[PDB]
């Protein structure tokens, strides 16, 4: 139809894929960079190992946000959905995925730098935690926009 063409589910499916994929890439960059920092730090300071794991967990929450949005837009998918709905799901997936990509990259860079600095200056651990919190709320913002779009996805669609 005009409002429900056959390719409308493509944008929803690819938005689901984007939501998981870009957030997983951000979380993987964060995990890899922070983990290299942790391994470098904990050769000489193994006592800070489990204290330095924080950036890796805050990278994982990015992929968790992507998973949340992927679950939502997957359960909103349908063979005969409107182009409105498909572009809503594409926008949700793209927003959360790009936000999680950016947030995970920032978490990786900042967590690497901060585990190294806290190895040298224990007072830097709190500052590093604060910067990582700021970096994590960005993936949260992408998730929030995805939630708004997904909530609006079911409106008046015929």
């Amino acid at each position: 139809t005009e409002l429900c063409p056959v390719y409308a589910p493509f944008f929803g499916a690819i938005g689901c894929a984007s939501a998981i994929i870009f957030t997983s890439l951000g979380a993987a960059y964060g995990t890899a960079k922070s983990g290299v920092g942790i391994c470098a730090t904990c050769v000489l300071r193994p006592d800070l190992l489990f204290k330095n794991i924080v950036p890796v967990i805050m990278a994982g929450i990015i992929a968790i946000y992507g998973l949340v949005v992927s679950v939502l837009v997957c359960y909103s998918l349908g063979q005969k959905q409107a182009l409105y709905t498909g572009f809503i799901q594409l926008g949700a997936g793209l927003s959360v995925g790009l936000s999680g990509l950016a947030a995970g990259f920032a978490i990786g860079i900042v967590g690497d730098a901060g585990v190294r600095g806290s190895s040298q200056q224990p007072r830097l651990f709190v500052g590093m935690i604060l910067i990582l919190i700021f970096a994590e709320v960005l993936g949260l913002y992408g998730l929030i926009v995805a939630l708004l779009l997904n909530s609006r996805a079911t409106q008046d669609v015929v």
Binding site: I61, I64, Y65, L67, V68, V71, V137, L140, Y141, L143, I144, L147
Partner: peptide, 16 residues
């Protein structure tokens, strides 16, 4: 606003 938003991590991690 940011902290109310941040408590969505409860649902996020429960879902995961």
């Amino acid at each position: 606003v940011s902290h109310t938003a941040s408590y969505l991590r409860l649902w996020a991690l429960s879902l995961a």
